[PDB]
Design a protein around this ligand. Structure first.
Ligand SMILES: Cc1ccc2nc(C(F)(F)F)cc(N3CCN[C@@H](CO)C3)c2c1
Ligand SMILES: Cc1ccc2nc(C(F)(F)F)cc(N3CCN[C@H](CO)C3)c2c1
Length: 281
């Protein structure tokens, strides 16, 4: 059963909601005790989106190691990702500290800072070359070097400096700017072109740390990005690409972060992206 044939059946029967609820029912549940400590209340954007203790990213400054971020480690696909929430006004320094400590080369952002009148993410990078950001709490400086604005996404070149050592690193910011305010994109073509730009940058390679991916909560749109990338890698690696079961991969990813793919529409879109992206590979 090619994925295309399955998709046709699901679409005809209108069963995307039933299949999505099955995934929810089967998903892993593990503790999130650290996330729930009182002193970490202001570090969580949403009270019902927490990282599991087993897979959470620890900040290395002693103090408070907590950030709402999870390491998704896909063993068969040989790729890792860090999924995180959109930074809060008080956690932008922790975010960049994470990127520094984890040796990430890329940040993937799948939201806009404001959507439907409402703040989804803090403005955690500089909009102007001449107006750099200093995160005084984690002793980091961030400068916009250049950007390449296109119709569906923007790629920025950032310089991140550890002010303690004066070491600097180039970080690439991949910003998908056109996800609709409601629902999902009608066609995955632009999402796929975005994904291919991330890939081609080398940001997902094993010589770097895991890419950091976020949206607002770091589980819906972010989950589509990692699910589509992993299923496409599994397709190219396996002798038989039609043995890739996207529901099984998503369940695997949900061992590492709760909630990945938040709606039936997102699940459908993930299928569509993997179908069309497989056609290109
Ligand atoms: C033909 C057909 C069959 C089943 C469907 N099932 C869902 C669901 F996943 F939400 F349940 C969503 C659909 N649509 C509407 C069209 N525009 C799309 C948004 O871009 C989503 C959809 C469409
Ligand atoms: C030749 C080639 C090889 C690998 C590829 N890998 C990906 C993806 F998604 F895996 F990164 C996406 C591709 N393309 C680019 C062209 N436009 C297409 C849809 O608009 C998507 C692609 C194309």
């Amino acid at each position: 059963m090619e994925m295309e044939k399955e998709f046709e059946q699901i679409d005809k029967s209108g069963s995307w909601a039933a299949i999505y609820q099955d995934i929810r029912h089967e998903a892993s549940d593990f503790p999130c005790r650290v996330a729930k400590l009182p002193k970490n209340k202001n570090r969580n954007r949403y009270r019902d989106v927490s990282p599991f203790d087993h897979s959470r990213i620890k900040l290395h400054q002693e103090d408070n190691d907590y950030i709402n971020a999870s390491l998704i480690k896909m063993e068969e696909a040989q790729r890792s990702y860090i999924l995180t929430q959109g930074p809060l006004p008080n956690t932008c320094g922790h975010f960049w500290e994470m990127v520094w400590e984890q040796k990430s080369r890329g940040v993937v952002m799948l939201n806009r800072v404001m959507e439907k009148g409402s703040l989804k993410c803090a403005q955690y990078w500089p909009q102007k070359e001449e107006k750099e950001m200093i995160f005084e709490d984690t002793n980091l400086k961030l400068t916009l070097i250049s950007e390449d604005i296109k119709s569906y996404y923007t790629v920025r070149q950032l310089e991140l400096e550890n002010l303690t050592t004066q070491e600097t690193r180039e970080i690439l910011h991949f910003h998908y700017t056109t996800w609709p305010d409601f629902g999902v994109p009608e066609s995955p073509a632009s999402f796929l072109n975005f994904l291919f730009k991330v890939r081609e940058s080398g940001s997902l390679s094993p010589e770097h740390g895991p890419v950091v991916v976020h949206c607002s909560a770091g589980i819906g749109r972010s989950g589509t990005f990692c699910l589509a990338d992993t299923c496409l890698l599994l397709m190219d690696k396996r002798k038989d690409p039609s043995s890739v079961d996207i529901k099984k991969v998503l369940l695997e990813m949900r061992k590492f972060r709760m909630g990945l793919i938040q709606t039936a529409d997102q699940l459908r879109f993930s299928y569509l992206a993997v179908i069309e992206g497989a056609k290109f590979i």
